[PDB]
Design a protein around this nucleic acid. Structure first.
Lengths: 93, 95, 583, 86, 107, 107, 93, 82, 98
DNA sequence: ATCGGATGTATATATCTGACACGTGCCTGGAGACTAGGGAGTAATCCCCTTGGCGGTTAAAACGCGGGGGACAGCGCGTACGTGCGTTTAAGCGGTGCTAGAGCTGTCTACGACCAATTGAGCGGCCTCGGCACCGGGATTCTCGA
DNA sequence: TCGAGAATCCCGGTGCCGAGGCCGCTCAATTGGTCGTAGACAGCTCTAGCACCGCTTAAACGCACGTACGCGCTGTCCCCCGCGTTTTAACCGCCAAGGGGATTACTCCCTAGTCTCCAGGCACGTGTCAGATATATACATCCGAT
């Protein structure tokens, strides 16, 4: 039985922002549970959107909207810019 | 002339009775649209929607004044004051 | 005394009337007397007193002053106002707008009267959703009219349109609706702007408290309501007594309407046709049933132990409402079934159990009246329990429902002997000439509703007597109200006297009526300060032959033993009666 | 196609009205300064809600804000409203 | 026939594959669009970048090289929009922002 | 081959069929057990019975034959456990419970 | 296009509790939206249960539990009794 | 197993400490009961929901995940335990 | 004349102490005995992972703390520096927790 | 003190009108019936983790207490806020009229589901050295009587 | 106001254990394929929202007037904070022993998926009646004067 987590991923990101900084185990468990949380929220919003408009399929456009609901203030603008760029490069390659 | 403060205590017993909407339509609508312009422009509202915003609004301020009143009474004053409200919105965590 | 003040008002009152353009001289200053009904009025001719009343109304606004007409029901008041109008259209060359107002049901009668008599004139009516009034309203807004006919309602609803337009003359009917100036209409008519001249009717002017004369009279001229408390002169004065309310009112009866002779008018049927054959005026006493005695006599403590005295506390006591809360009925029966002591508890029900059967044998069609609607429940269940053919009419009986109830009852062969009512509840106008027996119930605030109940029956065409038993129980609060409305009967009788010297504008008559009622007060005051099948058959006997069939009813019910009135022990019905009477 | 500029409509909420709301709440004696405080609070609240509603709308590519839009916005903010459909 | 990972194709640090699995196996809809798992992983990457950045800074300002929960607490709460977002979150071992009401101070 | 409705088979007033549809088409799980839609419809029936009962009573005590929102408001709020349940619900046209703090009263 | 609702159902229940009582239209729209609400809650709980225990299938037993979470106080005991009886009679017939 | 008055285990020193962390300056002597009341309530709710989840899973043990789902249920989201 | 601080100062040292560090402020064994004691009512004979008990403690302390924050806001609003039972009761009333 | 005027209040009226109820017809979503199989259920064996019992160490809780600073209650005052009346204006409503845009429908078509094969990344074991706890010791500073 | 003493920080040293870096290595990734269908998109209709007018009229507003309350002060009283010494009860370390989970392979039947086949629910209708408002009759309340 292998549990899963984002620990490795988080850690990579850390070494991208602060190459020198260790992250204690517990303080990883947080960031883990965090990411799972934000994921459950954003997904949940994608669902209860696609349900209303009677689409059957979560697409990007929903996820965009859902983000624009949950993330307050500037996290909206930045995050949206991020994802937009990401999918862009994705299709373009 | 009545003892000041009595006419109120008639008003309360009046308004806590009935259900009617306490804000004039046209002003409130003009307000709502005015706010709406910022986010997107050139919008349509079903009348019933505007009705909704009014309903939630009044039904919010009301509870607000209830709790505020609890605070002012806690302060041994009978008169609510801006600092009272500010306390309320602080306790609930609305801002 | 205040007569000279009244004279200064002879000058100044009619000064204000000059602004709105004895008293008798100066009130009649313009006399135009035409002794026939006009030309354009068609379909017959009015009676002497009728054309003289016409002529009277003419004399009113010849001098250009408003007024009242007190005439008794069924004396032709309708056709009278018709004639007055018509005379104002033709002989006065006025034409112009005329604002007439009625109660709804009567408006049919009115429309008919404009169909027969004056086809010559436009009569605008109103009913039937805003639709009909779109056409009709915009039709009037064009300036199209002769007569404009409507009810109380559409004065309020159309008050915009009607108020907005100029008018000539204003005809109120049933005018005692004006009784309280707090009534919406009374003030709306001032918000209504004005017809040039306003005019009123009544069957009966009303309570001796006399804002009524205030409300009406004041509403007759703006002068008058400016004069309200100069009425409070003799309205305070008239309202010892020989040297106070009599030696003064040996005139002041007059002197009030000795002033008001000219613009107020009246008549009586006994004066004009006097073809009313007869009817009897009787009362009875009853006993408070012991059950309705026990804790209910004590409801002074139940006043705190629950609603309100006069009705739910009081009138329940009076046999009127056995077990309206119904837990008392439960103390008798949960199943609400037929047995004794449910109906026995009341003088009403049991009493009828005694008296009615005799009538069932003598087949005299009975009338029954109330105020509180709900009595009619146990009344039915009682009648069915006796298996009696009866009809009731509630406040929920609709107009055409009413016509049906009438014609069925008024069918010649109708085998329903008793007919149930609640007086004011359905009273309106009605005619029952097929019923020979009237019986009255409970409090009936003010008599005038009782006079309604009576007018329902003895109206011309009723060829029997009319027996009347006002049903009262001994040692009962109903006696208080009864006597109260009885003193009302007195002083409003004095008011009838007002309508008397004022009625015929004669002298030996007016003094005959003076001495009349001033003697009546003496007698009545002097009188102020069991079932006995024999007695009952006596008060039920219009001949010793009724003493024959009624006493063969007493041959049987001689031998036969009649389910009586008193309910006498049942403890926990007492203590539990204190429970529920306290609950 | 009017040129649409709305300003100071927040004045449309009037000392009488706010006073009424206070009454319904059970307030007895207001303080004169509240009348601005309330306009502040209200304006905020509707900013949030109208925000979410508009967002739902644009997502559905509609030029209109239906009542259902609102009810979903309130439901989003944790204030559940009934009577307008769902 | 040589495989490249999607997370690379967009240049992301989060496993776009794993996301695209969780959406399906989580029953968040009938069908999962293709752009979605990407567009989501991007957002997550951004946010985690935000938190870890701030906690990194504060941790350095405590003269520590290794981030511990307290640092996360202070990073979140001190910032605004995060606090707006996490407001009901409770961080074990979190402690509290240093705070005292002014009137409590002696004078 | 004559059809009887499930809502009847359990003797319920709510359309057990319609429920069993909504569960599936709502993606609340992969598979819907058979007893479930029943067991749910029962509960709904019970609750709606509760509310409608109370609002009925209060409505009668206003001497009205026809239930209107105000009646629902008073029915809920006056009761406890419902208020516990609905606490964040807002009922349009709802009005407020009659209430005044004691100290506001004159003496 | 036919919208659906519980209006008829609600109305039946009403005539079971108070045979005499009308229910105004708006005041129906409430009870409607209400029932949809409680439904969404109870379903949602059934989901996020069956997810944890790694069952793939909502069954009765879950719905029971979910109810025992949401309904406060006695509404628990009564409601549970109700449903229990209902399914019982259901299978038994 | 009979446990009684363990709520005394929450002690005036401790509650006082919590107050301090909150930023309380001067306690009133009566609080010490009030707090025990509040706390006892809160844990009643949470332990309730957790136990419910457990029995549903047919386990005799309450895992941390149970709790975290209970808190999440009541609208208090906890991190760090999974 | 031994030395003593102005009363109320030692507190203002304690606050600056505790708002610093993260440690858990309730003794384990008492708190555990409490939790189990409550648990008995609902079901009997239960097992707790230690980490779970840790959770309940975490949420608990992390709750009372916020409670005392807000309460303190109330007491200050009352121009008193001392929180009182009626203050808390006000707090739990405003939030709507009971 | 009365007491007057405005407010409820118990039964009853008269009507007015728009909104609810019963309905007739129609359509498709639900029931009946059958089949496949996979999720679910249940033995069976294993062992990781909870619980109990222990004997120590001591930090921390309990208890006492003098004293002091906060609570709290009084209160004189002056002033902003209730009331209300007279004047104004903008809401409410009914109307007209236009049309942007909601809402539905028929094809389309890209495209996501499914599957089989391929394969590398991501996760369990498994070390290690250094970041960090901790201690003691002087340096500093911060409170509290002058 | 400086001075003393307790509080607290700093630095340097010490000792440890987990953050983290690798190593296999199973399996969940990714490629690479069809195919059935969600949903895009013209494309059409009509409806519900916007605009505007003119109208009663009920508000909103401005205002002067007075007094109830917010408040600043004060002084009385006391309940809580700052520090003893006492007592214990948590803590930590240690152990064993066993249940309760977890895993594992096995059977089987409940749900999904189709396929017809209706009658239950929905949409439009034309009606009756419940609320609405005005009226009739008392008495009782209340309150803000006397």
């Amino acid at each position: 039985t292998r549990k899963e987590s984002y620990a490795i991923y988080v850690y990579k990101v850390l070494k991208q922002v602060h190459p020198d900084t260790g992250i204690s185990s517990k303080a990883m468990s947080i960031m883990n549970s965090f990411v799972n949380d934000v994921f459950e929220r954003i997904a949940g919003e994608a669902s209860r959107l696609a349900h209303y408009n009677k689409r059957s399929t979560i697409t990007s456009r929903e996820i965009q909207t859902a983000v624009r609901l949950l993330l307050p203030g500037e996290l909206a603008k930045h995050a949206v810019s991020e994802g937009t760029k990401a999918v862009t490069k994705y299709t373009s390659a | 002339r009545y003892r000041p403060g009595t006419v109120a205590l008639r008003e309360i017993r009046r308004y806590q009775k009935s259900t009617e909407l306490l804000i004039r339509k046209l002003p409130f609508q003009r307000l709502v649209r005015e706010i709406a312009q910022d986010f997107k422009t050139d919008l349509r509202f079903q009348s019933s929607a505007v009705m909704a915003l009014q309903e939630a609004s009044e039904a919010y301020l009301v509870g607000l004044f209830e709790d505020t009143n609890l605070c002012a009474i806690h302060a041994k004053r009978v008169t609510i004051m801006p600092k009272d409200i500010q306390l309320a919105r602080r306790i609930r965590g609305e801002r | 005394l205040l007569d000279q003040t009244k004279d200064t008002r002879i000058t100044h009152l009619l000064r204000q009337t000059n602004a709105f353009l004895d008293y008798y001289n100066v009130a009649h200053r313009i006399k135009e007397d035409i002794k026939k009904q006009p030309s354009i009025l068609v379909g017959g001719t009015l009676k002497d007193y009728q054309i003289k009343g016409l002529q009277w109304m003419v004399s009113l606004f010849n001098n250009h002053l408003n007024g009242i007409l007190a005439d008794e029901m069924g004396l032709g008041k309708t056709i009278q106002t018709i004639s007055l109008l018509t005379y104002l259209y033709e002989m006065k060359n006025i034409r112009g707008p005329y604002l007439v107002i009625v109660p709804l049901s009567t408006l049919s009668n009115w429309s008919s009267e404009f169909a027969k008599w004056a086809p010559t004139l436009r009569t605008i009516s109103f009913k039937g959703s805003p639709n009909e009034r779109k056409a009709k309203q915009a039709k009037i807004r064009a300036g199209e009219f002769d007569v404009v006919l409507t009810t109380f309602e559409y004065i309020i609803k159309e008050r915009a349109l009607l108020s907005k337009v100029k008018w000539v003359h204003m005809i109120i009917d049933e005018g005692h609706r004006m009784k309280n100036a707090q009534s919406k209409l009374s003030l709306t008519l001032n918000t209504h702007y004005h017809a040039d001249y306003r005019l009123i009717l009544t069957g009966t002017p009303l309570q001796n408290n006399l804002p009524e004369l205030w409300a009406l009279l004041n509403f007759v001229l703006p002068k008058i309501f400016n004069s309200v408390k100069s009425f409070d002169e003799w309205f305070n004065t008239p309202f010892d007594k020989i040297e106070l309310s009599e030696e003064e009112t040996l005139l002041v009866i007059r002197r009030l309407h000795k002033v008001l002779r000219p613009f107020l008018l009246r008549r009586l049927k006994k004066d004009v046709e006097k073809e009313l054959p007869d009817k009897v005026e009787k009362v009875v006493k009853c006993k408070m049933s012991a059950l309705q005695q026990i804790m209910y006599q004590q409801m002074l403590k139940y006043r705190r132990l629950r609603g309100f005295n006069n009705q739910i506390m009081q009138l329940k006591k009076i046999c009127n409402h056995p077990f309206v809360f119904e837990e008392v009925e439960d103390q008798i029966n949960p199943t609400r079934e037929t047995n004794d002591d449910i109906w026995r508890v009341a003088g009403k029900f049991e009493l009828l159990d005694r008296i009615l059967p005799k009538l069932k044998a003598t087949g005299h069609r009975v009338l029954i009246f109330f105020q509180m609607t709900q009595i009619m429940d146990i009344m039915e269940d009682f009648l069915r329990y006796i298996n009696i053919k009866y009809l009731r009419l509630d406040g929920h009986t609709k107009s055409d429902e009413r016509s049906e109830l009438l014609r069925l009852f008024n069918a010649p062969d109708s085998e329903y002997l008793c007919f149930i009512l609640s007086t004011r509840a359905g009273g309106l106008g009605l005619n029952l000439q097929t019923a020979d027996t009237v019986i009255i119930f409970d409090t009936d605030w003010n008599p005038h509703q009782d006079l309604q109940a009576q007018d329902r029956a003895h109206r011309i065409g009723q060829k029997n007597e009319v027996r009347i038993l006002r049903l009262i129980t001994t040692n009962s609060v109903e006696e208080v109200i009864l006597e109260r409305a009885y003193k009302k009967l007195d002083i409003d009788g004095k008011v009838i006297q007002a309508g008397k010297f004022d009625n015929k504008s004669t002298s030996e008559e007016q003094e005959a009526l003076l001495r009349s009622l001033l003697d009546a007060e003496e007698e009545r005051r002097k009188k102020r300060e069991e079932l006995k099948d024999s007695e009952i058959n006596e008060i039920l006997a219009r001949n010793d032959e009724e003493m024959a069939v009624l006493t063969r009813m007493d041959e049987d019910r001689s031998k036969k033993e009649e389910k009586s009135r008193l309910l006498e022990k049942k403890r926990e019905e007492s203590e539990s009666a204190a429970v529920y009477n306290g609950r | 196609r009017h040129r649409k500029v709305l300003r100071d409509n927040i004045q449309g909420i009037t000392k009488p009205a706010i006073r009424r709301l206070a009454r319904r709440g059970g307030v007895k004696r207001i303080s004169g300064l509240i009348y601005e405080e309330t306009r502040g609070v209200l304006k905020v609240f509707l900013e949030n809600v109208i925000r979410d509603a508009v967002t739902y709308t644009e997502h559905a590519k509609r030029k209109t804000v239906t009542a259902m839009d609102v009810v979903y916005a309130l439901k989003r903010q944790g204030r559940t409203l009934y009577g307008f459909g769902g | 026939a040589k495989a490249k990972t999607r997370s690379s194709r967009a240049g992301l640090q989060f496993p776009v594959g794993r996301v695209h699995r969780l959406l399906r196996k989580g029953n968040y809809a009938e069908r999962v669009g293709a752009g979605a798992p990407v567009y989501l992983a991007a957002v997550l990457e951004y946010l985690t970048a935000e938190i870890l950045e701030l906690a990194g800074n504060a941790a350095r300002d405590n003269k520590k090289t290794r981030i511990i929960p307290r640092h996360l607490q202070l990073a979140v709460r001190n910032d605004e929009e995060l606090n707006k977002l996490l407001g009901r979150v409770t961080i074990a071992q979190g402690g509290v922002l240093p705070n005292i009401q002014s009137v409590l101070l002696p004078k």
